[PDB]
């Protein structure tokens, strides 16, 4: 039988504050449930957010982390899918393949466990995680900063069992979403002209997806230009710092386009960017892609007359992927050489160091740091 | 040769005064200019709110109109396609068919005469309207509230001669404008959901435009039930008035549809319903086409959340009709029976009596009113 299992997972007792490595227990799957020995996971902006306790929705204690690869270690009742030894990514998006938004082709939002997902806890109501006699709660539906995690079954895509593990891992976040906001929200087409504003692993997987799509120019943006070669050699044509024009950026970028890009996308999570990636493009058929999350509460604006005159203002959620059937097939890209991931990974720490991820984040030196559990 | 003509005409010699019937000149056709004999315009908001002058751009004397029927008078020099007795309808969006815009399939806003258009002004930057002693203004290109007007020759779609003129003058604006926002923008899928905002003729132009897509439920929103009866008769399949419900419209509308809709359309032009409209979009793949024209300055505004959970903001000109090509086809829908066009006039008056159309327009009871010249 699956017995309780004690490892080792990086706690947020509470906000504000830095992880701290723990011994945990880690119940055996229930009906419908897998549990994951996490090989690798990366550390994002996102879990930082979190942590910093400015979520609003965000509670403590809880074990944080999203972007993981892994092996599986047990399933429970009625699991025929999976089985132990399986390679595997945990998804937050997950994919129940019943739901009417499963069952929509234009869309990936799978609302099947959102509620007990949003609360910390297994599809059950309740959670797998304990440490020093109390409760600890999920993060995201996957937990991936804890030796081994528990997920909901819909939350596990099965994936090639050659991938490397300490690299597919960031498939479970940034490059999945910049690549899929390129080809599969903003479907541009051959020859398009484009501009990513936010240069991290998000919008240098947006470059990498407008290269695949066969995009004619790529204009990169960021204020902090040590970000400017690792897009270069991504397939930026070219990049510009907002900081250097006095004139706002959108301005620029019309003027540098005869009109403006055909396709923009926001990776920032900045409402006033937000607009400007708007703005930017062209009159009569410009789409802007909204790929950041701005804080709870700000709101994006312009002027109806922009709408009016043909640009069209969009959004993207895990690159639009249908979790469970994308990811392998985006983990076969990578294998098959298609896209790149590796290129994503500038720093590497072991997991009594996940701490120092946190610090690589607020020096502006990182683009995705991977932990080797 | 071609004389100067001298006939009446509706001045509007300034702002917020109503419009004067005079005896005005009209100078024969230039290079590349085409007189058409005006013989039924309609009135709708767009001329008012010049009228009003709270345009930013409106300027006086001018002559308003810009949804018209005719008959060619006669052409300047290098006129080919065109030729007296034609009969025609003007467009104030053109269609050179050689700018940037016109060789893009995904946008009908040809920029061949924008400048001098704006400007009340014919191509080589001058008017043909005078009277006594002074210029008087071209208006949208059109100028239909003359007994004679001058157009450039990109100007013109040369209909079917058998076409009832106090009729297909309506295709010139609202009717068009509606009817393509649901074909052409948002090109919704038969058993769509919809809702539309506003029903005016643009309001019942949607309508009539996702009837024919084959949309499943059409509900139309307005807070003068009195629209309610047309819109049914157009094909909503029921009516609701946000004044009716204590919460905002887009709550009650995703409550009625289970999430939302899958396209809502915006014909009112204000900012705030523009919001609720895009709201009232179901998550992850609700569409939304603003088509009212809000005042100068006014702003939309959401949060981008709700566009990265999958909702589009998209915006309409015309109904994205490539004017030229498409309005001849628009006026055998309608001889065709394919759409309708008589149900749009509510009112009838004679040239002396058009300033009645902007009372019946202010007081709610109209539609579209024809104005026979
Ligand atoms: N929609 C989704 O499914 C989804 C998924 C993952 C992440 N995201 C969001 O994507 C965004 C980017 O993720 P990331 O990992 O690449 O974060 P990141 O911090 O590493 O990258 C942000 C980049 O934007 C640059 N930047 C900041 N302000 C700027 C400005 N005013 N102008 C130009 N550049 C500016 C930053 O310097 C940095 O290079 C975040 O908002 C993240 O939450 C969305
Ligand atoms: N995009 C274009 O190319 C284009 C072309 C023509 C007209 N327009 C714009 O379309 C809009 C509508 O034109 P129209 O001729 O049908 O105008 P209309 O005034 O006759 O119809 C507007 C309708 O909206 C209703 N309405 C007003 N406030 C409302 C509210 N808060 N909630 C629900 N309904 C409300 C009014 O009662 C009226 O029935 C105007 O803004 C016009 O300028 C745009
Ligand atoms: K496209
Ligand atoms: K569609
Ligand atoms: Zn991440
Ligand atoms: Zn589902
Ligand atoms: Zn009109
Ligand atoms: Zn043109």
Not at 244 to 257: R, Y
């Amino acid at each position: 039988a699956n017995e309780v299992i004690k490892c080792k997972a990086a706690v947020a007792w509470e906000a504000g504050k830095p992880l701290s490595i723990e011994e945990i227990e880690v119940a055996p799957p229930k009906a419908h449930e897998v549990r994951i020995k996490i090989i690798a996971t990366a550390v994002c902006h996102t879990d930082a957010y979190t942590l910093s306790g400015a979520d609003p929705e965000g509670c403590f204690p809880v074990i944080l982390g999203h972007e993981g690869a892994g092996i599986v270690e047990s399933v429970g009742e009625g699991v025929t899918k999976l089985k132990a030894g399986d390679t595997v990514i945990p998804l937050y998006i997950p994919q129940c393949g019943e739901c009417k938004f499963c069952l929509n082709p234009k869309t990936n939002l799978c609302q099947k466990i959102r509620v007990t997902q949003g609360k910390g806890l297994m599809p059950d109501g309740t959670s797998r995680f304990t440490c020093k006699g109390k409760t600890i709660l999920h993060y995201m539906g996957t937990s991936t900063f804890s030796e081994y995690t528990v997920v909901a079954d819909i939350s596990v895509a099965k994936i090639d069992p050659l991938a490397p593990l300490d690299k597919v891992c960031l498939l479970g976040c940034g490059i999945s979403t910049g690549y899929g906001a390129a080809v599969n929200t903003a479907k541009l087409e051959p020859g398009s002209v484009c501009a990513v504003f936010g240069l991290g692993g998000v919008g240098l997987a947006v470059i990498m997806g407008c290269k695949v799509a066969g995009a004619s120019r790529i204009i990169g943006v960021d204020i902090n230009k040590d970000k400017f070669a690792r897009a270069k050699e991504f397939g930026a044509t070219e990049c510009i710092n907002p900081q250097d024009f006095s004139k706002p950026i959108q301005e620029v970028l019309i003027e540098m386009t005869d009109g403006g890009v055909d396709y923009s996308f926001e990776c920032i999570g900045n409402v006033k960017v937000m607009r400007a990636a708007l703005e930017a493009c062209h009159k009569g058929w410009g789409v802007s892609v909204v790929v950041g999350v701005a804080a709870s509460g700000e709101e994006i604006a312009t002027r109806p007359f922009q709408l009016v005159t043909g640009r069209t203002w969009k959004g993207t959620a895990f690159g639009g992927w249908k979790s469970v059937e994308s990811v392998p097939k985006l983990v076969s890209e990578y294998m098959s050489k298609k896209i790149k991931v590796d290129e994503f990974v500038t720093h590497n720490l072991s997991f009594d160091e996940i701490n120092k991820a946190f610090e690589l984040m607020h020096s502006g030196k990182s683009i995705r740091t991977v932990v080797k559990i």
